[PDB]
């Protein structure tokens, strides 16, 4: 029987090695656009191999009946679906529209069948989704409630443009014309305007009229609920959201910030930490479920040579003399910079030949010392041998100048410090697992990113090149397209970094809205679920004279007393709120200026006369050993240096104006006073000795990528510009620095620099901080690619493969480092919780009585209170309300009250408005008619239950929202106040979620976590407040450029608590930093006269701007990460206490 033979070929383990090479060579021929006509047979030979595999499996498993049992194993369904659709192509195409080629990409899923172990991972990636059902109902309920509100508030506001007035089909051909709109220079949308005294105003000669095209390509607006679902889905994921922030505030005015503070908190931060805490509870239960199942020439004088060399190697002070000689190599490479003399240059050519010569001579002694047999057995000596080889391969070339990534491989000697430093040993173990014990879960991740690069190329890549001129005004391809393989990989890599909205608009424009929402949202949902799993997996395997004294006694009782503390806490806040008024409009208002000059002398008398009252009361030694009392002592002492020298002598120059800017630290006195800010500060201070271990690694590990950047990119960012047309020349005429410099006499020509570049290891650190936080990273990448040589004009895509420098850094300096950082904190906070007397961190003592009385409210449930009255006429009413079919009636009437809200649209019809007003009017009538038939039937128990208290307010307020519609006609204009009262009929929808128990536990965790999260939020606000005053005094008068417009600015305190709010999400600080960095003409002007002020000048201060922004990105990262731990550690605690 041949069937007994085919089983011997099926089980034979060389056959499973042959299907593995079949796919991995097919996955190279999928990875190419416009294949040459060598492929028609090669396409058939692969089909010759996959069809033989299907014959060898049906014939092996049995007879013709067995073709049902071959198809019983559902990984064979994909093996059978391949050869069926290939054959259709072979027969011919009934309809040759040619999107059937992307079904051939399903062959790359046969690797899951071939490679051992990849099947049980996909069977668990799908298993961790099952637990996610409850969260996905709540996170789509909340995007839909917020979309209703957003639509109501901003429906139609995005089309407002700034149209002029006519010089005499009159009206509609004047509106439609793009010569009547107002365009900023170098922009392709019209400027967006506002009716209010708050939103943006058009220049003189223009009018803010509503008609227009809309922002972007028309994919941004808030009308049509389906667009307000997407405009608020890029807020949950925070993709480019600070442009949608700066477009609704430019339309609707700055007082609509309150909308985004609630959405960035309640949507973008709470709902993300429900998806992050339910995958982790489902992983850490699936991880625990496996360990439960796992438990249940003179050769004799050549030995005179060998024995004495082995004495040098074994004994110390040469092993200590190598780890010193590594650290003086990496501190010798770091002092390379671009404008560099040939004398300083020849030091570093000579100095790096020497350090190679040590580590080669040190390596060849080790081959002599032990033997070349035992030497290659232990791990580190293999690592040293590659570097000595690669450093000699790079030295041995001495001709090729297009191969200089190889002089950056000698930087890897810094990992030889891994044995001494036990935190850098952890970061090698994290990298070591993902190639080792978790190395099949990185295989899956790699395969998926391969598939979406190929699927995206064959669907969308042919159409980018034919519909070019809808995207780019040059009618060349853009920077980010899909016409090639490597570019569609770079799009799929950018989506996992989180930036999916902006390359989607290009795709939608190019191909269609049907496919581009379908592919770019299936990358993001599937791909972030695999990246997240890998991240979780890494953590879970990381860890496994008598009257003098009476007087003193008397004072002591004043300081401790409760009115004296309440008095001073009130005086901290006035001293802080008086700093907000110091904007550029203080020359304009004279009354508040002279008040705050004399109030400033009242306050420095209170905070001295309470200091001296506290020396006497506490003591002179009990005071200076407090270190809070130290913090108040320095702030008062600054306000005496500024107060005494105001009177006399060295008065206003230099270090006294510079002490004036230290007035922004007066709010730090409040940190000692509130008990909630002290419990948080005492816990963030308890984490510093373990944080400074990690932060020394990230400084060390990013110094390798910083020097590697300087070797590659230093000097290669300069470029020559035609100053009038303002784009850079092509290489065909101005390729060099010394050819742009011979065109200086026409005055049309300037040789300039990218602002954030790689000329130093210092400037490398700031170019790496923009790539790592993904804000600002595009200008760096676009110029790193273009670069040619040390004084040479760039070209548009020479040096195309650099992007991988930025790809390697994001995997290593961000993902791995992040992993290293998170695992330290959780093992810190667990031992700071076990050890601490206070059982729970981040709550005070007064809140834990509020905490435990709130845990009892969500644990109580009665199932027999309150029988009803007994009447004949009145008592027949409750007989049907009590039955189960009353609620099913209302709960389906209330989803139809939601769909009558969703179908509302800007500029709909006069007939459509009249219908929906009639339908909404009867939903007041029924929802009141359920209230009366429940309240009068349940005479006293109606006001009792807390759900029914919420119901009764909504029934009242919905009628209020109807009768007010005549009163608003009686009142003034209404884009502004008619809308906001109608927001409270969305509160009908809330009664909808009363029903789900699963969701009524997820809300509960949030409520439980509310007191802890308020204590850090006070702290975050406190630090936003100090940085808003320090930016208002420094960073006004800066030139209005990229990120500093005319609304979002540091000119006032409303403007600058808005800039500092958006950088708390690390978003858009690259454009706030970009006009600070310039000083000295051109690009900035010294002596610009600002009218109505005395502060002459325009320039920013590049040393204080870098200290401003890089402090706040590091500080608020540390604070916001504590708010992720507070929420996620509470969701675990709720499921634990069940």
């Amino acid at each position: 029987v041949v069937r007994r033979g085919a089983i011997k070929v099926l089980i034979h383990a060389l056959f499973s090695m042959f299907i593995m090479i079949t796919i991995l060579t097919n996955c190279v021929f999928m990875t190419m656009s416009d294949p040459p006509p060598w492929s028609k047979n090669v396409e058939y030979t692969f089909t010759g191999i996959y069809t033989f595999e299907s014959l060898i499996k049906i014939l092996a498993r049995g007879f013709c009946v067995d073709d049902f049992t071959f198809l019983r194993d559902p990984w064979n369904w994909l093996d059978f679906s391949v050869i069926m659709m290939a054959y259709l192509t072979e027969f011919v195409d009934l309809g040759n529209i040619s999107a059937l080629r992307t079904f051939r990409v399903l062959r790359a899923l046969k690797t899951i069948t071939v490679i051992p172990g990849l099947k049980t991972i996909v069977g668990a990636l799908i298993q961790s989704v099952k637990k996610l059902s409850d969260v996905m109902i709540l996170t789509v309920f909340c995007l839909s409630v917020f979309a209703l509100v957003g639509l109501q508030l901003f429906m139609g506001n995005l089309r407002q443009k700034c149209v002029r007035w006519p010089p005499p089909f009159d009206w509609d051909a004047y509106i439609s014309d793009e010569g009547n709109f107002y365009f900023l220079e170098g922009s392709n949308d019209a400027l967006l305007c506002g009716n209010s005294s708050d939103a943006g105003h058009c220049p003189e000669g223009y009018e803010c009229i509503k008609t227009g095209r809309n922002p972007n390509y028309g994919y941004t607006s808030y009308d049509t609920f389906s667009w307000a679902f997407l405009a608020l889905f890029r807020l949950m994921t925070q993709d480019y959201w600070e442009n949608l922030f700066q477009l609704t505030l430019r339309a609707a005015g700055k007082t609509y910030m309150i909308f985004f503070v609630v959405i960035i908190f309640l949507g973008s931060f709470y709902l993300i930490n429900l998806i992050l805490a339910v995958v982790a509870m489902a992983y850490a239960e699936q991880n625990e479920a496996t360990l439960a199942e796992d438990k249940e020439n003179c050769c004799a004088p050549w030995l005179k040579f060998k024995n004495i060399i082995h004495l040098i190697v074994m004994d110390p002070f040469v092993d200590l003399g190598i780890t010193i000689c590594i650290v003086l190599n990496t501190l010798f490479m770091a002092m390379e910079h671009y404008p560099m003399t040939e004398h300083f240059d020849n030091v570093l050519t000579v100095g790096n030949l020497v350090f190679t010569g040590i580590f080669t001579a040190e390596m060849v002694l080790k081959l002599i010392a032990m033997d070349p047999y035992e030497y290659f057995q232990q791990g580190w000596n293999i690592f040293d041998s590659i570097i000595v080889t690669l450093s000699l391969v790079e030295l041995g070339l001495a001709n090729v100048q297009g191969l200089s990534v190889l002089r950056s491989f000698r930087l890897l000697r810094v990992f030889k410090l891994a044995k001494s430093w036990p935190t850098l040993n952890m970061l090698i173990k994290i990298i070591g697992n993902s190639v080792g014990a978790l190395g099949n879960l990185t295989l899956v991740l790699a395969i998926i990113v391969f598939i979406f690069a190929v699927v995206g190329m064959q669907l969308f890549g042919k159409s980018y090149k034919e519909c070019v001129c809808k995207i780019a005004l040059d009618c060349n391809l853009p920077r980010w397209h899909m016409h090639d393989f490597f570019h569609s990989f770079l799009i799929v890599f950018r989506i996992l970094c989180g930036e999916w909205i902006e390359t989607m608009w290009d795709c939608m424009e190019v191909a269609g809205q049907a496919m581009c929402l379908t592919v770019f949202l299936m990358v993001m949902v599937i791909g972030n679920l695999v990246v997240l799993n890998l991240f979780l997996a890494l953590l879970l395997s990381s860890f496994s004279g008598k009257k003098w004294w009476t007087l003193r006694r008397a004072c002591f009782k004043i300081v401790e007393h409760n009115w004296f503390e309440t008095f001073i806490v009130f005086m901290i806040l006035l001293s802080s709120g008086a700093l907000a008024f110091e904007d550029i409009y203080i020359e304009q208002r004279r009354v508040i200026r002279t008040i705050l000059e004399y109030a400033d002398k009242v306050f420095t008398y209170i905070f001295i006369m309470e200091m001296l009252l506290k020396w006497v009361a506490y003591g002179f030694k009990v005071y200076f050993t407090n270190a809070w009392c130290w913090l108040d002592f320095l702030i008062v002492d600054v306000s005496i240096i500024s107060l005494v020298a105001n009177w006399l002598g060295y008065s206003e120059l230099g270090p006294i104006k510079s002490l004036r800017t230290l007035r922004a630290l007066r709010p730090l006195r409040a940190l000692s006073r509130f008990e909630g800010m002290r419990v948080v500060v005492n816990a963030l201070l308890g984490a510093i000795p373990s944080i400074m271990n990690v932060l020394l690694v990230c400084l060390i590990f990013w110094l390798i990528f910083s020097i590697m950047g300087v070797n590659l990119f230093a000097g290669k960012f300069y470029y020559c510009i035609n100053t009038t047309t303002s784009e850079r020349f092509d290489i065909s005429e101005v390729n060099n620095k010394s050819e742009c410099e011979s065109l200086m006499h026409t005055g049309q020509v300037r040789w300039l620099n990218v602002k954030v570049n790689y000329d130093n290891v210092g400037l490398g650190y700031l170019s790496l901080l923009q790539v790592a936080t993904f804000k600002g990273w595009m200008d760096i990448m676009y110029a790193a690619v273009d670069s040619r040589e040390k004084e040479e004009q760039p070209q548009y895509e020479v040096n195309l493969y650099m992007y991988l420098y930025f790809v390697i850094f994001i995997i290593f300096g961000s993902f791995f480092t992040l992993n290293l950082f998170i695992g330290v904190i959780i093992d810190n906070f667990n031992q700071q919780k076990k050890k601490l007397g206070g059982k729970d961190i981040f709550m005070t003592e007064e809140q834990k009585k509020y905490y435990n009385a709130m845990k009892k409210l969500g644990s109580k449930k009665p199932q027999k209170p309150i029988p009803r009255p007994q009447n004949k006429i009145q008592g027949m009413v409750y007989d049907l309300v009590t039955k189960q079919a009353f609620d099913i009636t209302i709960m389906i009437l209330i989803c139809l009250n939601m769909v009558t809200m969703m179908v509302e649209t800007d500029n709909q019809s006069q007939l459509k408005v009249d219908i929906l007003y009639n339908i909404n009017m009867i939903f007041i009538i029924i929802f009141t008619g359920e209230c009366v038939l429940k309240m009068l039937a349940l005479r006293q128990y109606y006001f009792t239950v807390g759900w029914n208290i919420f119901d009764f307010v909504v029934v009242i307020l919905s009628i209020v929202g109807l009768a007010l519609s005549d009163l608003i006609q009686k009142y003034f204009v209404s884009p502004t106040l008619f809308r906001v009262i109608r927001l409270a009929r969305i509160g009908r929808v809330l009664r909808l979620i009363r029903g789900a128990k699963g969701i009524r536990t997820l809300l509960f965790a949030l409520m439980m976590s509310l007191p802890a999260l308020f204590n850090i939020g006070l702290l975050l606000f406190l630090v936003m407040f100090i940085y808003s005053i320090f930016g208002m005094s420094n960073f006004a008068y800066v030139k209005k450029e990229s990120g500093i417009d005319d609304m979002f600015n540091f000119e006032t305190f409303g403007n600058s608590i808005i800039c500092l709010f958006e950088i708390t999400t690390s978003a858009g600080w690259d454009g706030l930093l970009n006009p600070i960095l310039n000083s000295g003409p051109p690009d900035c002007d010294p002596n610009l006269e600002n009218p109505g002020t005395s502060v002459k000048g325009d320039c920013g201060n590049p040393s204080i701007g870098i200290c401003f922004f890089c402090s706040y990105i590091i500080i608020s990262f540390l604070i916001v990460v504590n708010m992720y731990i507070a929420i996620i550690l509470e969701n675990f605690n709720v499921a634990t206490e069940e």
């Binding site: 002029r164 010569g179 365009f183 900023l184 105003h201 058009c202 220049p203 003189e204 000669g205 009476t550 007087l551 006694r553 008397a554 004072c555 009782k557 004043i558 550029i584 409009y585 020359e587 304009q588 004279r590 009354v591 002279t594 008040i595 000059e597 004399y598 109030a599 002398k601 009242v602 008398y605 209170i606 006369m609 009252l613 008068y1037 209005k1040 005319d1046 000119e1051 006269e1089 600002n1090 009218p1091 109505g1092 002020t1093």
Partner: protein, 173 residues
């Protein structure tokens, strides 16, 4: 940027004085070229005589009558954009008291068309011979010393309340 500040209304005889006329355009990015025109009414009947015309670059055309040599430009210099048109009077006399008007005549430059506008700011100044300082620099200087002195008496009353409290509780023991 540009802040519109009102001028002062009290001038001191014999001294110098500066009259602020700050006209800021709505978008600070737009080009313009301006000039101006100052008119002045006495304590006489209703006339408004042109006194100067600052057209452009450093030329300033003025001098019909009553004062030559005591009016200096102190606005924007070398711009043509203008935006600040402050005059400056050296050696104020008693016949400089009255009503002033600056007429800003901008001409905005847009991508296809020129748009001519005009603003008028009205300034009323008084020549005295002894500068009254303010009214908020009297009331706020009083209220500083009132608040400082009342706050010490709130301590020394409480400091001697508790000092008599503790020594009387020593009497009871």
């Amino acid at each position: 940027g540009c802040v519109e500040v009102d001028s002062e209304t009290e001038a001191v005889y014999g001294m110098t004085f500066k009259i602020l006329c700050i006209s800021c355009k709505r978008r600070s990015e737009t080009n313009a070229e301006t000039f101006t025109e100052w008119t002045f009414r006495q304590k006489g009947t209703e006339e408004f005589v042109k006194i100067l015309r600052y057209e452009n670059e450093v030329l300033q055309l003025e001098e019909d009558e009553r004062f030559e040599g005591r009016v200096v430009w102190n606005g924007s210099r070398g711009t043509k954009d203008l935006q600040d048109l402050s005059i400056f009077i050296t050696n104020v006399t008693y016949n400089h008291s009255g009503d002033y008007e600056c007429h800003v005549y901008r001409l905005l430059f847009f991508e296809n068309y020129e748009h001519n506008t005009s603003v008028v700011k009205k300034i009323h100044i008084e020549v005295v011979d002894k500068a009254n300082r303010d009214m908020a620099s009297i009331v706020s200087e009083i209220m500083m010393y009132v608040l400082i002195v009342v706050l010490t008496i709130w301590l020394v009353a409480e400091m001697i309340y508790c000092y008599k409290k503790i020594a009387a509780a020593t009497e009871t023991a």
